[PDB]
Curated annotation (Swiss-Prot):
This is Protease 2A. Homodimer. It catalyses: Selective cleavage of Tyr-|-Gly bond in the picornavirus polyprotein. Zn(2+) 1 binds at C50, C52, C110, H112. It comes from the Viruses. The active site is at H15, D33, C104. Cysteine protease that cleaves viral polyprotein and specific host proteins. It is responsible for the autocatalytic cleavage between the P1 and P2 regions, which is the first cleavage occurring in the polyprotein. Also cleaves the host translation initiation factor EIF4G1, in order to shut down the capped cellular mRNA translation. Inhibits the host nucleus-cytoplasm protein and RNA trafficking by cleaving host members of the nuclear pores. Counteracts stress granule formation probably by antagonizing its assembly or promoting its dissassembly.
Amino acid sequence: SGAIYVGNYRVVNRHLATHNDWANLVWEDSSRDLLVSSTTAQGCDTIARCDCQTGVYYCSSRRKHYPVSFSKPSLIFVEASEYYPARYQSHLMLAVGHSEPGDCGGILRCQHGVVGIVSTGGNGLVGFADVRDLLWLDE
Ligand SMILES: CSc1ccccc1CC(=O)N1CCC(F)(F)[C@H](C(N)=O)C1
Ligand SMILES: [Zn+2]
């Protein structure tokens, strides 16, 4: 679990979005595993606008933050689940680090702010859905 609260927006993993999120839908993309819903209260997370390949993510299965090097956002193949058939997930960045299902939603940050959220993992790897290209979140 976990979300990004920026202005009048809430960003979550699409596979974990609630009935409230769907009844206040702004945008969603299955290929990215993202869903953005509207909020009445003002969010104070800052989104980074950079090309950083290093940062820190929160890992709930260890109650710890870890520093990581991560790849540039790309199309990476992801195996079937109760949420999605076998497919390429776009805007995904991989890093060598611990993750378990339950860690999805953990924020990844660099010195410029919020980079993205945990969305995939396994085999000593962790995948993050990038949010830095969604320029409309600030405006
Ligand atoms: C941190 S997720 C993780 C970690 C270790 C091992 C396994 C997982 C689970 C995982 O990779 N999934 C299941 C959930 C999901 F939303 F459908 C993901 C996706 N974005 O398609 C794929
Ligand atoms: Zn950065």
